[PDB]
Design a protein around this ligand. Structure first.
Ligand SMILES: Nc1ncnc2c1ncn2[C@@H]1O[C@H](COP(=O)(O)OP(=O)(O)O)[C@@H](O)[C@H]1O
Lengths: 186, 70
């Protein structure tokens, strides 16, 4: 068999097997729901919408945003997102691969514990891991030492990494990411 | 000399011709007892509201679970 990785670095969400050059496709992690009485009776009512489907559908939908400050706000919504992503894009079953999780560093245990709890229970999945952004950033950039700045959709980072080790005291973590900037924009 | 068919028909007709009386009688009278319900339109409102606000949405998870961390 084969091994599969979810990116849950915030913004559009990235998922792909080991060894593909780039993830198959990517989704905002918008979540949105209806705003108005449903008045085409012909329409099937679906009460929650996600992804480019929503990105099209947006106007009467209204958005919820399931990650604040890199902290994922509402678990069951995530579960909706996650399920959708597997089945609709990936055509994948939880047994199929080990799965790898992508985490803001230095943030509350709860995200660890519930994430794992859900994904081992709700999905049933051979192997699980959660990994800190900077490590990946080095591996891709291929210099065993370094310091990384990556200010995504979500909380904004400084980590020096020396070759082969962490300096967790060294590390700085900031909620300055582009979303809040954008809301300043208005 | 009289009061007649001719006059009675006149009165009848006039009655028929007066739009103000009959229309006012039906519309204005029925206008007053117009409305009583817990509107489903407001059910929509309430539901949306439920979906609306972070104080419910974020706090329901974050107050509840971040209570127990470790
Ligand atoms: N073309 C672009 N130019 C500048 N910023 C962008 C562009 N596309 C997306 N972004 C921003 O980059 C971020 C995308 O999320 P991401 O960087 O993956 O966050 P995270 O680090 O949490 O994964 C968002 O802040 C988004 O607004």
């Amino acid at each position: 068999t084969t091994a599969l990785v979810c990116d849950n670095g915030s913004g559009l969400v990235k998922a792909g097997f080991a060894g593909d050059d780039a993830p198959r496709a990517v989704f905002p992690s918008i979540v949105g729901r209806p705003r108005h009485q449903g008045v085409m009776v012909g329409m099937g009512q679906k009460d929650s919408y996600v992804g480019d489907e929503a990105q099209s559908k947006r106007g009467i939908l209204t958005l919820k945003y399931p990650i604040e400050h890199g902290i994922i706000t509402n678990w069951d919504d995530m579960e909706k997102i996650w399920h959708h992503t597997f089945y609709n894009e990936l055509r994948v079953a939880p047994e199929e691969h080990p799965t790898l999780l992508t985490e803001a560093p230095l943030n509350p245990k709860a995200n660890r514990e519930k994430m794992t709890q859900i994904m081992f229970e709700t999905f049933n999945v051979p192997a699980m891991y959660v990994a800190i952004q900077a490590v990946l950033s080095l591996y891709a950039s291929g210099r065993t030492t370094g310091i990384v700045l990556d200010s995504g959709d979500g909380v904004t980072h400084n980590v020096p990494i020396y070759e082969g080790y962490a300096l967790p005291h060294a590390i700085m973590r900031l909620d300055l990411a582009g979303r809040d900037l954008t809301d300043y924009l208005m | 000399x009289x009061x007649x068919x001719x006059x009675x028909x006149x009165x009848x007709x006039x009655x028929x011709x007066x739009x103000x009386x009959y229309x006012x009688x039906x519309x204005x009278x029925x206008x007053x007892x117009x409305x009583x319900x817990x509107x489903x339109x407001x059910x929509x409102x309430x539901x949306x509201x439920x979906x609306x606000x972070x104080x419910x949405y974020x706090x329901x998870x974050x107050x509840x679970x971040x209570x127990x961390x470790x």
